[PDB]
Amino acid sequence: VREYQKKRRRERIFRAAMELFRNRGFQETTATEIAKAAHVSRGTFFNYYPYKEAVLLDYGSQLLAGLREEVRRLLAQGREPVEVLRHLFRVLAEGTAREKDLLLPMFYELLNPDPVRARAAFEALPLGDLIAEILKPLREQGVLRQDFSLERMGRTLADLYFLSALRWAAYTPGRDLAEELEKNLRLLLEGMLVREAPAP
Amino acid sequence: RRRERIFRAAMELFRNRGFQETTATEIAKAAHVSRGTFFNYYPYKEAVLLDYGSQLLAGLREEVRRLLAQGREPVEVLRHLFRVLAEGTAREKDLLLPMFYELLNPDPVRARAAFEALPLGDLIAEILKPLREQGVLRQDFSLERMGRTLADLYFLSALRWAAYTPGRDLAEELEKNLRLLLEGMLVREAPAPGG
Ligand SMILES: CCCCCCCCCCCC(=O)SCCNC(=O)CCNC(=O)[C@H](O)C(C)(C)COP(=O)(O)OP(=O)(O)OC[C@H]1O[C@@H](n2cnc3c(N)ncnc32)[C@H](O)[C@@H]1OP(=O)(O)O
Numbered sequence: 001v002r003e004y005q006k007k008r009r010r011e012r013i014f015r016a017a018m019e020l021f022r023n024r025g026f027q028e029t030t031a032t033e034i035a036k037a038a039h040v041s042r043g044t045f046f047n048y049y050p051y052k053e054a055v056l057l058d059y060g061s062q063l064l065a066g067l068r069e070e071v072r073r074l075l076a077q078g079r080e081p082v083e084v085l086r087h088l089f090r091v092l093a094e095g096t097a098r099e100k101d102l103l104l105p106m107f108y109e110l111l112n113p114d115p116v117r118a119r120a121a122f123e124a125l126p127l128g129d130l131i132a133e134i135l136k137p138l139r140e141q142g143v144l145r146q147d148f149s150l151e152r153m154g155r156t157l158a159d160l161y162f163l164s165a166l167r168w169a170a171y172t173p174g175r176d177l178a179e180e181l182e183k184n185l186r187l188l189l190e191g192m193l194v195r196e197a198p199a200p
Numbered sequence: 201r202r203r204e205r206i207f208r209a210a211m212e213l214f215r216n217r218g219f220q221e222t223t224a225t226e227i228a229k230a231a232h233v234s235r236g237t238f239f240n241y242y243p244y245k246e247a248v249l250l251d252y253g254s255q256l257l258a259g260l261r262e263e264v265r266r267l268l269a270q271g272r273e274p275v276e277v278l279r280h281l282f283r284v285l286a287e288g289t290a291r292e293k294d295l296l297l298p299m300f301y302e303l304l305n306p307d308p309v310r311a312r313a314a315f316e317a318l319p320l321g322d323l324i325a326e327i328l329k330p331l332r333e334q335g336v337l338r339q340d341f342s343l344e345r346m347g348r349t350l351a352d353l354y355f356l357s358a359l360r361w362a363a364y365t366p367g368r369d370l371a372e373e374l375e376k377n378l379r380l381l382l383e384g385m386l387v388r389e390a391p392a393p394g395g
């Protein structure tokens with residue numbers, strides 16, 4: 001019973017924090033307000049979430065898990081891997097824009113000077129590995145290079161998504177993020193060098 | 201000579217005591233100027249790093265334009281540029297890290313100033329020009345845009361390397377960025393390629 005009670009307590013604290021972050025802002029909301037809203041002590045809030053960003057990482061992990069189900073579902077349905085890739089970035093751009101105010105402070109956590117926290121953020125948001133799953137079928141199809149691992153190429157594309165999304169959210173939210181992510185995808189997938197146009 | 205005296209004094213304190221630990225007050229004293237005078241030249245400490253970075257880039261720019269002039273192949277010049285960047289980043293990691301972080305300073309005004317002081321993307325675009333003229337680069341993206349994307353990959357790689365994982369071979373990491381962005385992840389196995 002204690003296990004269930006702890007999971008329930010963590011979820012209530014999580015819900016309480018997300019609502020406050022949404023309604024009043026992430027930076028403006030304190031651990032004491034979250035604790036009060038979830039009916040726990042300030043000390044208990046920290047036992048579950050050592051720092052406020054850990055709450056956002058939990059949300060990000062949830063978002064990524066949904067994207068993982070979606071990607072696996074599409075591949076299983078027989079969608080072309082490249083189209084699944086384009087779709088993923090399209091939805092990533094759309095979702096990032098919808099949740100901009102919550103995701104921005106989350107993105108900075110991946111740049112935390114403290115390496116333990118940067119690593120924690122990285123492990124909670126493994127987009128690189130999800131991309132690698134889409135590249136896999138391409139490698140088996142013989143159209144993907146094999147001098148670099150799937151994980152390394154996936155990591156690279158995810159790193160680009162990260163920098164584009166962060167700069168978009170922090171400095172140029174008026175620009176078209178979907179267009180920017182499509183640019184990253186095309187450039188890394190096809191390269192800057194021209195390719196063969198098939199016969200009509 | 202005050203701008204140069206301040207820069208020199210600041211770099212020496214950073215060298216001997218550390219960038220984070222050094223204060224404007226100490227730099228001013230070491231350069232024999234008031235704190236007020238120091239700020240006219242450098243509004244904030246990281247601006248000294250931008251000046252340093254801008255100078256390193258100017259050096260690379262000379263070397264690059266020079267090699268192209270003497271007929272070196274564009275791709276080879278690009279390969280050279282990144283070998284140089286990897287080596288330099290490794291040698292000056294402690295001072296370059298806070299500079300890299302200033303590039304993502306939440307304050308848009310500061311982020312912009314940093315970007316404009318360190319235009320690596322524009323230099324890469326200069327190197328791509330001969331390739332554009334040969335007609336072998338896609339035209340749905342400008343040279344500046346593609347060059348800036350390759351510079352972004354250098355930034356991401358260098359920041360990770362310097363802040364979290366210096367055990368990686370940074371030179372190979374940058375060659376990987378170059379290979380992937382130039383050639384793409386998709387194979388190039390046309391039995392009859394162009395050229
Ligand atoms: C909806 C919102 C979405 C939101 C989606 C958000 C996406 C964000 C994406 C990331 C954005 C950024 O990180 S921006 C960059 C700045 N931030 C960061 O880097 C985050 C913090 N970074 C780190 O903690 C580190 O750099 C890591 C964890 C990323 C990687 O470090 P690491 O694993 O020690 O080192 P790495 O170079 O990866 O691996 C070294 C060798 O170990 C090998 N190796 C592989 N597996 C293992 C293993 N099980 N056990 C031992 N070794 C292994 C690797 O193949 C490699 O071999 P070999 O081939 O080398 O010989």
Ligand SMILES: CCCCCCCCCCCC(=O)O
Binds near residue numbers: 253319321353
């Ligand atoms: C020898 C070290 C030279 C360091 C040059 C740093 C250039 C950083 C460019 C960052 C571009 C960007 O992604 O905004």
